[PDB]
Design a protein around this ligand. Structure first.
Ligand SMILES: Nc1ncnc2c1ncn2[C@@H]1O[C@H](COP(=O)(O)OP(=O)(O)O)[C@@H](O)[C@H]1O
Ligand SMILES: [Cl-]
Ligand SMILES: [Cl-]
Ligand SMILES: [Cl-]
Lengths: 738, 791
DNA sequence: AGCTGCCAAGCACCAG
DNA sequence: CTGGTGCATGGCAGCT
């Protein structure tokens, strides 16, 4: 009668579509929780037993197979932002101290919690207000002292200088709240969470949210991983590899040595792609199975598949023996064999065990001698009762007699009605049905004790011998994790080498001065979805050629050449081969892309006001080591104010900063900077006006544009001949003051 | 792979396949026993759509048949899932009595559930219409028809071209759309939910004419006005054929067809309807729309009427004026009426289920309850001195006699279904009471028997009980079962009990049961006889429910007009809009900060207004509130202003920015082609260019065409100052702007419309504000100056 | 104050 | 031939 989640669940049924009285049936509860937790709801239920949150789940039902699922904690100190991100499924722990708001944007974009944690002291709500899975936390939780002790307790030693996170408090606070929230939901220790690291910005190539979205790295603009760079590159054969590949794409790195290693790896492995993958496909999501082992929730089929992986190691060892590559061999060693455990599990568990342990049938016969005997006793008792059925049927002549069973009455003999009158004298009746009568006899109950007590003693030992396995395997968890790390990395590398082969990517060769030198380069995502031949394009950007002014019609052609550039760098500085014939590329410290739509529109500020704020970010932070992409800025204001701003912008980018820029514009006036400035040149996109359409060429020729194709499109859109004729007049007369 | 000849299938499957063959594409619920079965693909597909298990049904030879199914009583929930996923289901039943059947009992498909023909409450949304529509492209134009099966509203139009057809579908939003196989222009239709590809022969004109006429019961269709709409009549032909084939009873509530023709309403293209946020916001939701502000109606059938009215503003003066002098007249009575109207409820659809002979007892319950409010409203509306309100009151009626019948026939507050008894109240039928006497007189007698026997035996635990299988029994705990009389014939056994029968008990079981069942079948006759009595007054009852709906809307609008402070607009001869203190009807309510009122003055002399200012400055709101004030005026409503004076309007255009290109250029082309001097046109960006003065040259030429030739009333907002040069060159084009001021370090917006073009575009000030380095802002200021030296 | 498995009813199966 | 059984999902009696 009283209360419940009914009122707050009519809320979430309103937003999953199942209906103050809405609900879910029992048989699909795990699938329905799978989508509330999906969109971030801290559930725990009863028509309390179990507790589940969106940031702390390990059940492979409730997690999306191919993507990370992080729990994170944020707070805005008087000085700066403190932030931490845990992967409850791998024990991958991150900690960070963003300085400015723009850094705290770029993290939240890259990382993307399914369950955020935040404090009252936090006043910059515009950063996280419209976020999935928001939870609110007190003062005490963000603590610095209990944190250290609780952290150092979790990990190992009496200090965190080994992890390198010691003299950075704002991050330790986040971490402190996070771990203590995560152990709470679990109500069990977390041995897999054995370390923690802090990314140092200065290492990775820095990409802000707007840049990270506009490139569509893991996520397209609409919301999916459809039609995105991941989609085209992720041909990995294990889920843990898929995850790793994505984390890699968002974290391109500047240590050109760490890259060169990955390039020589992709090289050596390029031939073994054929039969290195069908083996690796069978390693499965070991990284997550191992997490269910740490949390002691790993089901029979988790251990069965863990074993199946162990079978693939000597084969992978044997294949990677051939590979003449120092770093590939490091990964061969790190993959390990664990042959003793392979044997333990083969002996300890049958072919294909059931979904759950609850009802026995998991531990294979031979492993433990006690358990075998009990089964034979229980098969022993099962035997006589089958005999008894036959014994009794032919003895009485009643062909419809049956020995049956349920928890209500235990074992029972069942004659049908009509034949029921011929029931033996000693047959104690017990239960009449529409067309049957059920009896018991002294012997039956005697053997019923036999079957049940036998089963019960074997079934309760299965669970001991099972829980034992964990105490036998968990000591190695250390190495086991580094195996599934090494494996997931093979998946990724062996993929990045196959992709390079069957998409004809070249190997970029880095230079020490800033500059890009693409030769027949393409947008890695478009050249696949497009079913017409992709027109490749060149690019040269020495510091003698610092900025290209791109004029002529946009229509996607411009904002591709630009976007394909940023991706050929991204892909370079991630070690992967790149979609081109040759690519020499210099160091890049930051990638900026102010390209495409958007527009807010939630904050009442407009497109333009957005574009400028994005352009403000660029000008303030862009170094001579940065790539800068600027789709036709200056639209949506008076022709003069926008030309002045595009001029003023190009001026400061072409001189004060010097950054490697592609500057798209419609303004013809801007095509005079090659005459007024050092190191700035003109390129344009053509169109051909064939038949009854205009073909928007995507080929980048040199020089400014000598034609504007606006009126031309108007004619094709149905705009009356008379008006375009009158437009043409006014164009001519506006252009011949300029 | 097996050859399956007809004669090889088991007798059951033969009856299935000739039935499924009649419905090859849609799912088929095959009533078999207490379940509705599905088979083969129907079973696999149905298993996935419903989360029900797939299974086998055994065969002698050959592979077993796939099967899924659900119990006949759980049927609705599952129909609900399927209909809300756009699937149709054919509901097939058992006709004959299987006891008198040696072979398979006769089985017929009795109705078909489809997303466009649903009429039961549990499957429809209350505050929203759910229409079925048919679409047909001729050698010359289009034919489109709509039906509201749960109210009978059956309309017909013949859209001129691709773009109007686009308007209509956007507006009506049918939940199921019947198109001919040879439909030429498919980008109009594909994607849409509940599509239904119909064979060309279903759009035959003669069949349509003859079949519409049979249904309406007239010789020709001249009184309806649709005798000269061939194309329309066709789509209506197919829309009707479908309706009958889905329902499979007669449809007496579908009694009339009227025709929509564009001249009778302000036409509004897809973009316009979506941009004005009339019933759906810019981001899909129903929140912060014109209707969220206006709909405070108290019944669902009113909400839906208002929502329709909002989308089809009438141009006929008399209706408008009548509506006005009603809204005014009813200003004070908007507390006396409303809560009494609330209790009338969704009578519209209740009468639909009555038309279909499908109404549940509680539908009658709520129908009675609604009738009881009619003398309480009649006595209220008499007082009001309003010529139309009396006409509506006359229309509303009383149904003194029928309110009576429902008080005598049915109980206080009945169960959900008739199915198993308890609906018809005492004294309505003596024979039902005779059989209920026998029932009650046998039950209490059996309880006397309980006591009678407990003495006769002394056994204290003796009970009398009833179980569905065995029936009436005498229960003795096993602890005393031995002490049971020799009279007692043991019938059922349990673990701690033993149940018996005696020929007295079984004699009175057979009387209580036989008499209970005679009551049931009699209630079921009595209940299905109510329809026979009420149906004769369907027409009168329908137009009453209509009058209650319209009143619900008008009463609401009156209250709205008071609560939110609107004024009555007046209409003029010439085109024009003269607004005094014109505020945005939705944006004024969502704000906390008092909404700045703002005038407007458009006439044939002053027909275009170039709106300068900066973005964020309030430019769009101004344009939008202009169209919204116009639309409300033209549904008869009061207006969010002080004094609004408005000329005849035929269309309202919207070219407000953001594509998804080429789009914006077409929507512009659409305006230039179809705009007359009675239309209102609101534009943000007519289309971008690819060079500096490229696209700007279009805007100029277009403004010129709208001003010189079309002479539409235009509101053109723009940042391009080259266009504030237009009032100098062009006749009847003026300059206005939204005021903003820089107080040094930041910038504020006045939201007030001033004459003359803005002092400057604040492009640079906004960039500065956005964070662009002072450093660079300065540079731009210098480059500006030199541009204005030659300008 | 839950859970378990009989049963609903048509028709086909199939073991005696 | 006769008398048993299978087979969807839901409801309730018969048991803790
Ligand atoms: N008359 C007004 N009074 C008060 N606020 C207004 C008024 N007009 C507009 N606003 C507010 O100004 C904001 C921007 O208005 P909008 O018309 O979108 O500007 P623009 O069209 O120039 O970009 C809106 O969010 C609205 O809340
Ligand atoms: Cl058992
Ligand atoms: Cl009507
Ligand atoms: Cl502006």
């Amino acid at each position: 009668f009283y209360e419940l989640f009914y009122d707050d669940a009519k809320r979430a049924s309103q937003l999953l579509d199942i209906s103050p009285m809405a609900g879910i049936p029992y048989h699909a509860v795990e699938n329905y929780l799978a989508k509330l937790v999906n969109q971030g709801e801290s559930v725990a239920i009863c028509e309390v037993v179990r507790i589940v949150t969106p940031g702390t789940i390990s059940d492979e039902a409730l997690l999306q197979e191919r993507q990370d699922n992080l729990l994170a904690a944020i707070w805005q100190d008087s000085k700066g932002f403190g932030y931490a991100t845990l992967d409850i499924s791998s024990g991958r722990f991150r900690l960070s101290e963003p300085a400015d708001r723009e850094t705290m944007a770029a993290e939240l974009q890259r990382t993307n919690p399914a369950e955020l944690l935040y404090a009252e002291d936090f006043a910059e709500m515009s950063l996280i207000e419209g976020r999935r899975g928001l939870r609110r936390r007190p003062l005490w939780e963000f603590e610095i002292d209990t944190a250290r002790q609780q952290l150092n307790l979790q990990f190992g030693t009496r200090d965190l200088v080994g992890f390198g996170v010691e003299n950075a408090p704002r991050g330790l606070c986040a971490a402190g709240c996070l771990l203590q929230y995560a152990k709470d939901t679990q109500r069990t220790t977390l041995p897999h969470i054995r370390s923690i690291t802090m990314e140092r910005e200065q290492d990775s190539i820095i990409m802000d949210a707007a840049t990270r979205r506009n490139l569509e790295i893991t996520q397209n603009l609409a919301g999916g991983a459809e039609n995105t760079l991941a989609s085209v590159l992720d041909c990995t054969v294990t889920p843990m590899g898929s995850r790793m590949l994505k984390r890699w794409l968002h974290m391109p790195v500047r240590d050109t040595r760490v890259l060169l290693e990955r390039q020589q790896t992709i090289g050596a492995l390029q031939d073994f792609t054929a039969g290195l993958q069908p083996v690796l496909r069978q390693v499965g999501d070991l990284e997550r199975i191992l997490a269910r082992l740490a949390l002691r929730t790993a089901r029979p089929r988790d251990l069965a598949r863990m074993r199946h992986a162990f079978q693939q190691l000597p084969e992978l060892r044997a294949q990677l023996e051939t590979v003449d590559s120092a770093p590939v061999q490091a990964l061969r060693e790190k993959m390990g064999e664990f042959a003793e455990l392979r044997d333990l599990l083969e002996r300890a568990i049958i072919d294909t065990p059931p979904v759950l342990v609850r009802d026995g049938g998991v531990i294979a016969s031979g492993y433990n001698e006690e358990l075998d005997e009990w089964r034979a006793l229980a098969d022993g008792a099962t035997d006589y009762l089958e005999r008894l059925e036959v014994r009794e049927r032919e003895r009485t002549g009643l062909d419809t007699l049956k020995v049956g069973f349920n928890a209500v009455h235990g074992y029972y003999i069942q004659i049908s009605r009509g034949q029921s009158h011929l029931a033996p004298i000693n047959y104690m009746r017990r239960q009449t049905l529409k067309n049957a009568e059920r009896y018991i006899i002294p012997e039956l109950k005697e053997y019923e004790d036999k079957v049940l007590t036998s089963k019960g003693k074997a079934l309760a030992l299965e669970k001991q011998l099972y829980e034992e396995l964990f105490d036998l395997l968990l000591p190695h968890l250390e190495a086991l994790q580094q195996s599934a790390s090494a494996l997931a990395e093979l998946d990724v590398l062996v993929n990045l080498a196959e992709r390079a082969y069957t998409l004809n990517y070249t190997c970029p060769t880095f230079i020490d001065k800033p500059g890009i030198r693409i030769t027949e380069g393409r947008h890695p995502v478009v050249e696949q979805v497009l079913n017409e031949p992709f027109i490749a394009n060149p690019l040269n950007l020495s510091p003698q050629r610092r900025m290209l002014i791109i004029t002529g019609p946009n229509m996607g052609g411009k904002s591709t050449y630009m976007r394909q550039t940023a991706l050929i760098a991204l892909m370079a500085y991630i070690g992967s081969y790149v979609p081109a014939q040759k690519v020499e590329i210099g160091p890049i410290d930051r990638i900026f892309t102010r390209v495409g739509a958007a527009d807010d529109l939630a904050s009442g500020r407009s497109t333009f006001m957005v574009e400028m704020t994005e352009t403000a970010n660029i000008l303030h932070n862009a170094t001579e080591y940065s790539l800068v992409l600027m789709d036709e800025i200056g639209r949506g204001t008076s022709t003069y104010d926008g030309l002045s701003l595009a001029w003023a912008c190009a001026e400061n980018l072409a001189n004060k900063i010097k950054a490697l820029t592609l500057f798209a514009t419609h303004y013809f006036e801007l095509t005079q900077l090659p005459e007024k400035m050092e190191g700035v040149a003109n390129v344009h996109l053509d169109a051909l006006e064939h038949g009854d359409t205009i073909a928007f060429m995507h080929s980048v020729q040199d020089g400014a544009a000598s034609k504007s194709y606006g009126l031309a499109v108007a004619a094709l859109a149905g705009v009356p001949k008379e008006v375009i004729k009158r437009a043409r007049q006014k164009l001519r007369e506006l252009e011949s003051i300029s």
